[PDB]
Design a protein around this nucleic acid. Structure first.
Ligand SMILES: [Mg+2]
Ligand SMILES: [Mg+2]
Ligand SMILES: [Mg+2]
Ligand SMILES: [Mg+2]
Ligand SMILES: [Mg+2]
Length: 59
RNA sequence: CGACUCUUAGCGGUGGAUCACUCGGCUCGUGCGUCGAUGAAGAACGCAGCUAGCUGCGAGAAUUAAUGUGAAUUGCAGGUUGAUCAUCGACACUUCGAACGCACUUGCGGCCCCGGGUUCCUCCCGGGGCUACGCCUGUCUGAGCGUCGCU
């Protein structure tokens, strides 16, 4: 071939993709942060009740 | 006289000594002599109907399963096919931390696979699995006017 540049760079190298012979974890972790765990409980204070009454919103 | 002061005694205060108790120490001896990338020691934050501390525990959060035991736990409520305790082999085990995508603000990514938008056509949202350094054996892809062999 021809060398038109004075510098030497590391040649392009083919690299494989991970192909494990066994998953490291037996099962995926259950999603502990779900919709039931998102909401804990509503608020019942004076400001919350007024906010529900007028602003059409929940707390 | 009366006040004040002093002494002694009774009683009452003040104080917490002495004595008697002791689920604590100290010392000696005996058997065993076991941590961690399958993530340790340590730290942080959370978890109880009423819970601050101590203790216990980890979003399955003062505990799940299993076994033994056999009618309680208790401060107040409430509700034998096994209550409560103990054992502990199944399961689970938040964030940091050797701490591991990059940094330490919990900020910013990349790749692959799923569920929402789509009805993959790409974005966007959610979920899951990987993405640290060094090193060993093997595999693949390479480099060298290094040593050569055929053209
Ligand atoms: Mg006196
Ligand atoms: Mg608490
Ligand atoms: Mg049980
Ligand atoms: Mg039982
Ligand atoms: Mg900064």
């Amino acid at each position: 071939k021809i060398r038109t540049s004075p510098t030497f760079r590391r040649p392009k190298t083919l690299r494989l993709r991970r192909q494990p012979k066994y998953p490291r974890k037996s099962a995926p972790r259950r999603n502990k942060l779900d919709h039931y765990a998102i909401i804990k409980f509503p608020l019942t204070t004076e400001s919350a009740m007024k906010k529900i009454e007028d602003n059409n919103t929940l707390v």
